[PDB]
Design a protein around this ligand. Structure first.
Ligand code: NA
Ligand code: NA
Ligand code: NA
Ligand code: NA
Ligand code: NA
Ligand code: NA
Ligand code: NA
Ligand code: NA
Ligand code: NA
Ligand code: NA
Ligand code: NA
Lengths: 173, 173, 173, 173, 173, 173, 173, 173, 173, 173, 173
């Protein structure tokens, strides 16, 4: 799987591939791994099971609601529940969330993580390939966030055997 | 084991082989791996032990009962429990469930998988062989869902040493 | 890797994908895994390294040359050498060879395998997926050997993470 | 694989299944693993590659020729060459040979082996299942050697996942 | 280690980082992993032991001398010896070689890999990060082969813990 | 990771690098591995998973609250729970804690370690490089605890591939 | 670690080294591994973690308190608990306890070991080296228990890489 | 083992510990691992067997003689022989050599290695501990090369269980 | 350890060696592994820890008391408690008990076991060596039970490295 | 397998059972594991593969022919070749040889073992049971070498699951 | 095995036990592991197989013969051959050699080890136990080299389960 997010010129984009694998074979090629949350104001991508994601996103939504849409505070609270609840600790998904203010990665083992000056984030087995391509593109071209995410996902999909080239890409605003 | 499901022209079929193996030998060759649940309105196939299957199908029916028969919602709820409950986590299996509206694969690893547009799902050691055959038949013939399931199970049985050719096939309506 | 061969109505076809993988990443996606040998009269496909393939195909041509172009005899002779020569024993690969008379799988483990009556052979990690599809197509359609090979390779490519969809297909005559 | 031989009432029979496996999948279901050698006077079954068998049987034929058809002496000489020649030691096949006088098993690691009062011999992963059935049949029924071999192969094929039910059976005289 | 090679508009460049690690520690940071061979007409880089690579570089030159300096033929011949020689099989490394005509990866597992149409090759633990960045830059900028190699090496170095940012870059002509 | 603590002339400092690695790649470079606990009266640093460490930091505060803020007693109590609790035994980490009176390493293997007379403690993959540099500086210079921690962390970072040079340094008072 | 005890002419001594190791490096070189318990009337040495030791010695004192200071009875009772309690079973250590009447080794594997007639006991990775030296000294010199313990610990320290030469030695009376 | 070399203010020093270990025990504590070669003009330290060292040093001496005392050229030739001769490849020692001009590390697998601006080199299991201490000392004190080597060896000996504190130190001039 | 029991001519004897081992070394050479229970009327030998034995024998005594000295009934009840109590299941000792009526082996995993016509029983790593010698002696000599046990223990001690020749032998009456 | 040899009062006997097992099943029960070599002047028995043993028996005869029939010298020479030859090192077996003068065990691990004063040797999985019984009988009865071998083999057969009770016993003269 | 050598007041002694073990059982208890070489002027003890010992001692004598009886030179020469010769590299053993001038340990890993100033050397599984005892006796008694060797071997034999108490001791002059 490869999920990558790029923020450039007032726009933030989260995009992911569509491959669901079991061992060395493909169970599904058109999975949608990026969704819109909080009435469309938050983009969320996930590497992991759909049931794990449903659980984590519903919980994140509850947090956003109680924290007046504050992404970082909601994310910190989510990570706290994630590592403290015995049921939630069983969830191994990895998440990327982004709103008009900031982008973050959240995982059960690593808590919350913010980007570097780059404003590029990536997760999944193919994450570092998309990251390498995105950094090259951000630093050497004037491409929009959307173009960079699409191009980076393609490059990662052509290298990682667990990432395909059927993408779901969401952009804000 | 091979369980395969195809939905075509208003009919959905779930079929499976009958081989139960211990190591490299056959303990039983006429196991029934597909059953009808929820007053006969839901087809369910499983790759795993019979006692494990009983536990999981009983719980799935309880979900169906409390979630107004909605398959996807019940499947996700079952997956969350399976993924997090200490007892259920010990159950190693894969399930395929289908009703008049849709078909799903339920796993114990936090995933619920929907089919590609061809509406074909398969699980078990020989699942990908039946899947390959079913996709070829759906995309290149006008055979019925039932006929495709029967032919795909046979092709899988002749290839996978853990799948035999004694089938149990259920159809809805 | 996936190599598949089908013989139908006087035509024999051998086709393969183009993916070369190292671990879980792609080193090359346009490898040509099928070549014509013996003055264009023999089709050969291989699952293994390119240098290994060169050595084995060169030896197979020498066998063809000294055994009056008889495919089965040359194949058995190649297999005996491959099975017993210290240098050749180090070569890990599977080969499919076909001429106007017959098709064979040659292995380095002392076996030469002839097809079932459907005249279909397949090797490689995704071989059984193409085999399943090819058998379904041969037994249920009137598609040409070429069309079956193309469709089977595609089905295998969409399932096996080590097989892609960039094909090389050779036909005889 | 299962090869079994039974001698009863002046008749000797050698029969084998037809499954060729690679890992947990079937490469071929109609292999003929029993052949007639020495102008029909010797029945020979083998568990192993066809190239290994071709090699071993050609060598055995040469021995029979020089030993005036004496099975035991030819077998002893074959086993000697088998464990002394570095090329032959690479051959892992297992053989059963029978003529009108005696039946024998020959392997590269175990040399020559003669039956017990039973006059039943079996080799292959399913060998002991056929042996168990054959002993039960010889000791408790008046069935002919041919009937016992056919029935025993079936019983072994239904238990061993590497043995199928497509048999080749040869009888003397 | 990260070695990356790019060929663009008549210029062929091979670059590598300079980190040598023992276990999870840095032993040296200024290693020269790219060398000029064959009277300065060939560029070669390596991932793996220095002694091992030097041994292979010498043998490759001998192959070039033997085969009229033809890169592909010499690479296949080196790959064959590497695959079978008792001592060379003990050598752990991957190589990239390039001349004015072509570029290749040589492995010790029977493979000689040509690049895709982008004409880029990369090897080493950080190889795929440099590969991702290089493909992004070749496909979306007009940067020179040299610039792309330096930028891709830097991107790989900021991701792979075994790749640093002290490069040796060689070009032809 | 490298965490090092030095106590010299009334000043107690705990510093750590900021690299978080996934496999052999850098996931983040600005992690905060040293935190102020117990109303800012305790400094704590960790080597291992972030979620794991956060869970242990919370439990340590509860021990401090329970045992009147006595560091050693609270550390021994945390070590005992860590050693026996089903869930805590799954937590992989090593901790350094320090207050105005003493400094300690807490492990999950039943050990609470006090420093030697030099009053230095270090943990993490690069811990012993920082320990070596710190002892050299404490024994041969008049540098402050803060300066020694920064210099030792830098020396560790230039040697350990999992330790970078972006530090978080905390001091008491 | 090396702990050794010798009883001679009305004196019993327990001594140990000070090395605490993690893998192949030293975390602490001045650990005190021998303490006085039960109002100073019992000597106790341990090979294991300090927190584990605290738990076990605290329990041993409770046993002493309820069993009228009888060492053997208290030791057996401690061993039964250590062997069967879920929490205690997680504690990996070896203990030596001695009073004015006798000396014992207590283990977590259901054993309490009394010394041979020479009244010498030793535990730890270097225990058998101190044991060898102590037996030689007791059987061939008139040295005091204290002198023998000191010399034996030194001999063990010079041989075992996990035992150092910084001793803690306690004597009774 | 720990061998470290420091060059400062016109002086070069090579020093080593004296521990020879077999598994986790010490076979010898006073080994001399630093010798003077080339009539005293070259200092040479080694981590490895004495017979390996005798072999390598005699060969190095021959080289120095033929190269008019040129250290780098002699070292390069030594490394070439080392990786090309089947007998020499069996030698696993690691060497450090230093004369009035330069210092170098030489190993059978890494060929020749020159220092960084530091002019500090170290080898052996304890090498990086001495290196860390030496770098701290060179950068923050005015200590002579001899004092730094003595102090660094001590620090490494107190951390590494395979390095002791019985040193042999040689200085030029 | 070796414990053996022989009953002959109205006498029953239980004898054991005295070696207590930890890994490949001896912790004690004069252990008494055979005791008299039930006021001398029952002989009991044990292979295992002394604390485990103390526990099991005290429990057995309680049983004998309530079952009016009936050995088999007491043994059956002991084995029942042993496999049903979570604390007792942790005890891995093996026992042999004998009174004037019968001899039995009792273990936590095998419950109760009675001898064959032999009236010889043995347990411990050296058990089968003593058993082999005892059977030879019972069947071919007129030696008393005591002589046979002494001789058999010696033979086992000379073969098994975990059994020594310092025996404790008890006889009834 | 169990092979045992006894020399008593001028008679030298070597006996063995006849079971050949494949995995945990009996393949044959009448194997001949003791043979007469060197013009019937030497008795030899083997534990291990039949082909392997036959190869070693032939080579041993060649050593006898080379060294004037001296058993010890020939055994040491066979042991040396067995220990170093590429092909012989692959042979898994243990041998017992005996002539009118002496008896020896030959291994492939550089050992040639002479018996103790009882003049008994035994090898194979059941070797030590036969050894125990044989020593008991030699030391406590006046039975002949032949009788002791038969009785010891039977005792071993009733204990070792890989040893049966169909013996081949050879004697000299 | 335990071999120990002590040199005191003009006498040098080498002594060893007699146990030869296979796994956890004794194959022989009276092996002679110490022999006199070079016209009785050299004492040699070995831990390893008897055939391996013969090969190595024969070669050592050839070295002695061509190097004018110089022990150290001959030992180093033997070690170089042992370390590099394909045949000798297969010999797993440790040797102790001693003459009227000095004592040495020779290994197959390129090392020749001289004793500490106490002139004591020991090899074998129980070597460090005899070493500990010998050092205690040499430093604290006036016992002769012979007496120390005898007492140290006994102490080692009572501790190491692979060393027995049947000694062979040789003295020079
Ligand atoms: Na992909
Ligand atoms: Na099947
Ligand atoms: Na694919
Ligand atoms: Na079957
Ligand atoms: Na890096
Ligand atoms: Na670093
Ligand atoms: Na030590
Ligand atoms: Na040390
Ligand atoms: Na013993
Ligand atoms: Na048996
Ligand atoms: Na012993």
């Amino acid at each position: 799987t490869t999920i990558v997010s790029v923020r450039r010129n007032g726009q933030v984009v989260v995009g992911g591939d569509g491959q669901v694998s079991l061992g060395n074979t493909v169970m599904k090629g058109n999975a949608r791994k990026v969704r819109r949350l909080y009435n469309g104001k938050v983009l969320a991508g996930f590497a992991g099971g759909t049931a794990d994601a449903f659980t984590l996103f519903e919980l994140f939504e509850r947090k956003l609601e109680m924290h007046q849409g504050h992404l970082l505070k909601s994310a910190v609270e989510l990570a706290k529940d994630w590592r403290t609840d015995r049921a939630l600790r069983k969830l191994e998904a990895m998440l990327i969330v982004a709103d008009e203010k900031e982008s973050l990665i959240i995982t059960g083992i690593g808590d919350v993580v913010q980007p570097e000056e780059d404003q590029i984030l990536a997760i999944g087995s193919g994450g570092n390939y998309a990251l390498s391509a995105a950094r090259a593109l951000v630093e050497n071209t004037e491409l929009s966030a959307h173009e960079i995410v699409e191009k980076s996902l393609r490059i990662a999909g052509d290298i990682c055997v667990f990432t395909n080239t059927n993408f779901t890409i969401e952009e804000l605003p």
